Design an enzyme around this catalytic site. Sequence first.
Site, PDB file in Angstrom:
ATOM      1  N   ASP D  21       0.893  -1.176  -0.089  1.00  0.00           N
ATOM      2  CA  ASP D  21       0.066  -0.037  -0.045  1.00  0.00           C
ATOM      3  C   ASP D  21       0.743   1.177  -0.085  1.00  0.00           C
ATOM      4  OD1 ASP D  21      -2.684  -1.243   0.146  1.00  0.00           O
ATOM      5  OD2 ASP D  21      -2.334  -1.780   2.196  1.00  0.00           O
ATOM      6  N   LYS D  24       3.976  -0.653  -3.171  1.00  0.00           N
ATOM      7  CA  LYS D  24       5.334  -1.778  -3.378  1.00  0.00           C
ATOM      8  C   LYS D  24       5.314  -2.358  -4.748  1.00  0.00           C
ATOM      9  CE  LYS D  24       6.867  -3.851   0.293  1.00  0.00           C
ATOM     10  NZ  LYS D  24       8.031  -3.484  -0.202  1.00  0.00           N
ATOM     11  N   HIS D  84       3.645  -7.316   6.739  1.00  0.00           N
ATOM     12  CA  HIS D  84       3.009  -8.397   7.091  1.00  0.00           C
ATOM     13  C   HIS D  84       3.041  -9.273   8.435  1.00  0.00           C
ATOM     14  CE1 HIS D  84       0.111  -7.170   3.862  1.00  0.00           C
ATOM     15  NE2 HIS D  84       1.060  -7.614   2.832  1.00  0.00           N
TER      16      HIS D  84
END
Lengths: 77, 80, 67, 393, 203
Positions: D21, D24, D84
């Site tokens: 976001d 990337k 993540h």
Amino acid sequence: NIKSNEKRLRQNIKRNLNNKGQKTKLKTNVKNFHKEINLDNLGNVYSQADRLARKGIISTNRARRLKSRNVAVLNKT
Amino acid sequence: RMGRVHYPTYRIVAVDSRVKRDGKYIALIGHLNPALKENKCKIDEAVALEWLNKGAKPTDTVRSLFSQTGLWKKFVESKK
Amino acid sequence: TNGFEVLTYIPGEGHNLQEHSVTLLRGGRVKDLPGVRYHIVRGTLDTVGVEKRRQQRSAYGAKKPKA
Amino acid sequence: AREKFDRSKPHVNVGTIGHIDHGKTTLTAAICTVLAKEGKSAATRYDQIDKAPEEKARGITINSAHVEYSSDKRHYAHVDCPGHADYIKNMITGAAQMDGAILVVSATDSVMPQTREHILLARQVGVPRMVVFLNKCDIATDEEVQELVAEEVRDLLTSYGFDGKNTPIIYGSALKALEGDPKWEAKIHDLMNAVDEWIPTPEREVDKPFLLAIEDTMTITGRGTVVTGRVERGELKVGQEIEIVGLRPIRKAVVTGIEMFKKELDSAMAGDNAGVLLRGVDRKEVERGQVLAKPGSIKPHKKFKAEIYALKKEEGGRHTGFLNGYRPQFYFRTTDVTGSISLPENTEMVLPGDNTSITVELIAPIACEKGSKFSIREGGRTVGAGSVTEVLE
Amino acid sequence: MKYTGSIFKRSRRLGFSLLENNKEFSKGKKRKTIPGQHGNRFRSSTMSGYAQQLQEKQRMQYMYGITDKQFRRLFRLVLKQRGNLAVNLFRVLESRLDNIVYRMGFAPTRRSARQLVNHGHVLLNDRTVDTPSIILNPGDKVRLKAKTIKIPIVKAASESGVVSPFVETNNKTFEGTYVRFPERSELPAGINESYVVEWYKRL
RNA sequence: GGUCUUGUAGCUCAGUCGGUAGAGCAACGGUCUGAAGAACCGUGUGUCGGCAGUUCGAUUCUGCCCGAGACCACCA
RNA sequence: UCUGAGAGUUUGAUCCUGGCUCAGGAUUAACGCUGGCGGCAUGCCUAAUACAUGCAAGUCGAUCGAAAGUAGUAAUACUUUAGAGGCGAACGGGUGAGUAACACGUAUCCAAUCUACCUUAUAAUGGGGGAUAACUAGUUGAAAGACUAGCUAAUACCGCAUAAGAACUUUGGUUCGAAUCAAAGUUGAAAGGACCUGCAAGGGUUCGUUAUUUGAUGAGGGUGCGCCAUAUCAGCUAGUUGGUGGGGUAACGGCCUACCAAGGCAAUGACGUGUAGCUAUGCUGAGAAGUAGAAUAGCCACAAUGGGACUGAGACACGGCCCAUACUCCUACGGGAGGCAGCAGUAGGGAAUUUUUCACAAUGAGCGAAAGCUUGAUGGAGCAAUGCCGCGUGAACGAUGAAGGUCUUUAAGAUUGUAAAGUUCUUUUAUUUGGGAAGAAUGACUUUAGCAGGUAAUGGCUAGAGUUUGACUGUACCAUUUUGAAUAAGUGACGACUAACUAUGUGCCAGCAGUCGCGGUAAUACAUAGGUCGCAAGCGUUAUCCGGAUUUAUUGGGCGUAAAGCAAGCGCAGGCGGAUUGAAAAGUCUGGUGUUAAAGGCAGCUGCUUAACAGUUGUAUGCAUUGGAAAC
């Protein structure tokens, strides 16, 4: 894949067509002999058959058998 | 050729190309072994005559062997 | 490997059964068992007992005794 | 055959730090598209790197990989390192394979604690003067919020010991660079000139025996099993013998062929991202994240002594002390090997920080050499940090 | 096995003596205790005709110190020839290279002959030997490989060496030959070919 | 490498939402029996696979790890 | 002339019968422990499961127009060929699913057969027609490609004629169902490419041409036979059987067709049914034989499945074609594309059965004047202790014997044990060094010398001079080429079987176990340890076969109480048959001849540093034919 595959596939069609056409040019003489019997048509059949019997288009030994048959049945009449 | 591995041997034979090598031999013309390049060839010397007179070209090595004997200048008169 | 279900003796000392483990087998008639002529290669699979198998590990394969 | 390369463009390994976001995927596409013109053969993937469900659809990276892109002066491989959280190991391996990288911090989606830990680990393993790029300057073009992003990036770098006051943070946005605006395309040129210094050229050497870090495991149709990764050190060619080491008995195997990204290469040396089709190996026997070696090389070690400085909460570490029976996971560039912190005598309950000489035994023997700088993590966070001091086994 | 290792560990059990007295004697005291402490009082545990056939196999085999593969192979080869197979075999069993070298007065032990043949220091008919398993026939030349004459062991052995009555040498040239076919009397009569030849049920 | 199941005694299982670790058998000793079986039983048998938070010692509230295991990782 | 191994075990013991078990060899062997090297041969049996890739068939331009390119301003010259034409394409490679039969053979009939090339021999290599490939232009589809119209080459294709000799007709003669000969009738043969010699005309060289004649070659069919288990497999066959005619095959044939009829197969096994590539061969045996029909070989079958057609000398063709089917893939979703039982390689299987290797150096193949070409055939290299073999892991010396494991249940002493320390001594391998073969007395290449028909040139052939193409090679191998015991031993057993004892623990618990058997209380047996023993770079076990087992008996049995005489008689087919005389000699013995390839069996010899292996010669058996005997 053999290199001489597509080339011979394109080539042999002419041979096949020639053989198929030349066979019936003698078949018509044979049928004419069926329609009426005389020595002239026997000579014509032999002259037309000696072309294909020379090559593998008509089996030479089969051509001999058939010509013997024709001349024998003609000798009957 | 036919022989032991690392032992080059090629026995002289009158074989037809329709038959593979190591298959059935028609007439084995003596034998040959390249393991000694001074003299290791033997043949019957009688098969050559009419086995050439009736065609059917055998293995090509027979010509070089004929050179060692000069067979042409004694066979051309019989040929014609 | 076939659909057959065959009874066999558990060879070697100890036990490492896990109720559908994989076993590498062996023949061998034993008269203490009526009609049993099968065994297992105890030592090279998920079952690893055979402690101090230091006389013969050609049968019941295991690491060579360190001397 | 698979279209043998002729390796003539020298290689530097590059990566990414940050989160998605930030654009990337768009940055990964833009770098290759931009460098394709000024440098021939810079292959690009935006959604073509993606190859699996939830990587097609969701777009996040779960099995991290590489993108190749070359210039008329240098070749580059970019590691798609993830954020993540719970994927942190996937980033570590990237940082395990890493010589240079671009810190992806956008002016809108700025540094989060995940990127904080990413930079923490990047500094801790040891990266030479990392290069930073400020992203997303097209949307929300700011005058002080951009200054805010830059200032906190420099502060985060300094908090780990970087010279953040001197770290280059190139502003701009690669979204408009890929879109076609030269005003932002030239910012990538500014970034790559800033890369030319402080991102060094690896030394392809012949004296070292061999070393390979696994990134993935691969199988070809009709050929066999391929193991891919990066050749950290050592020379290689087709037909040599290599041993699998660690987590398995040291097993000998014959290499069938050396490649890089599915196509065979000239020769493998130190610092080369490559792969190898192997003779008589199994894709199950090899595992993603395993170390390799050749016979007659450094021995694998379970238990060894080192000097470790734990992670203070003041810089993003543990908020409580760790025990002796404590079971964190060590990392040797490929794996999360678990080993209990066998703290020295009189020390059982040790608080974060406090660089101390401790010895630890591992569940698996990994090849350790002195001077090797690694990290220690457990519970999803980094708990320890140090370098090997002495090998006892 | 390819070698023998310890030597009188077989002399103890087999009642063996190649020097015919000194393979068990003059080492403090010539003792007849069998290998191991278990020598209290033994006559026969399973000692019998088959057991003495095994004993004679291990005696003749190990008084040359050879393997079973070679010995079985050479017997299989002798099965291809005719005549009295036992005596022809024993002559052949005495006619290879290393037994000849030992009997030339040149090798302190047949193990030494095997080592020297292994070391390539023996030359036979201008053919360097790497394996002493040649079967020799009358009209062969065995020399010293003069480049290896620096060995003191061969020097000591050659001068006062025992030359067998059927092969003859000269130490002035260190060269010898298989002159004739030997006779049985030159070999000890304790051995009997019958034991080993009837022992053959494997082949 | 992640989507998830799972490791409680020697084995199998029960265990209010934090107060507590036990049944059946393996199995030690008594009752036992002319001797042996049968036998009624009392055991010992665990911080619950190992670690990090929370607080009332955390299987219990979660998370991490080791291992096994139903999906995805040249793979059009 | 030629070859022979045993043992225990019923019970109280014994004698007899008797099975069972073991000691032994062999394996696509794997697995278990362990593992240095070389020579040597083999290396997916499972799912005849699918399989990216390469390569497994290409070659000829001196067969051809024409294309492109370069040296040349050109003229052209030269290289290749987009393509046509020719050759090979059916050789070869690998899997035995299938088939229980003229499949494999064997001996034979092919008066029943052909046979591209190639051999021998005979006649010539004519004149024309029509062209199109190639190409040009275009559409459409992604391609698969097709069509609309033009344009040119060949030795491409096809008329005419000559056609000796042929073949087919008529007729005549001719010998034992065939065949030669005399005459005529019908009808049928091609070709040019390069080139020498020529001013040219022409002659001709050389490759080939056609009709020819000789062969062989191979193919095909048939006969007698031989080779599975099986009658708890007795009726079966309606083109089946025979006859007539006709159609079709290289040849003859209910091969097929229509007609006339009901025959044909089999109890001495039609067939029913399970399985199967057969053979040579490999293991065992003394033998016949049992074993498997590994690896290779001979032959045969097939090519994803089922059909079918072209061409060609032959194919329905592993890697040619159409269709349908199934799979897979691509797709423009309308339609197309592929057949590793070709080598390696992968996925599934199994316990597993070599590399996605180098060279076409050599053999071999063809295509070609030649040059040159390719050749998953072939030679190799590599993997596997796959199997055998060779070969090390040090030699001698070293004493009443170091320490020490054990024991005698301690203090001796012994064993380990010349074992040790150690005195030197050393290198096949290992390790640095340089050299170094052969395989290439291949083939063509070019000139030289000589030969021959032919002369005016050549061209064809033979010898010498040189170049050679080496994959392996850096091979084998060696000179103290430098150094070095350094580079290397495990495995199983120790109760009798079937060679190999002590201690501890254990108490029918654990477990070992082919047998007996051992541990519910001092285990030779079980667990471990020391000692002993045996095989060894392998050891053991697994599983199959064979021997032992002469244990369904030709070698090599009995039928009273251990299985076995039918309950008996009548008795068909059948088996077995008194004596003497004759015949033939079918069977039989026997001599000669042909064949049963070769490898392999055997003996000698040779290279195998020695053997494995390969080669040299000789080398049987069975069948058919011929000369002998009447013994039966």
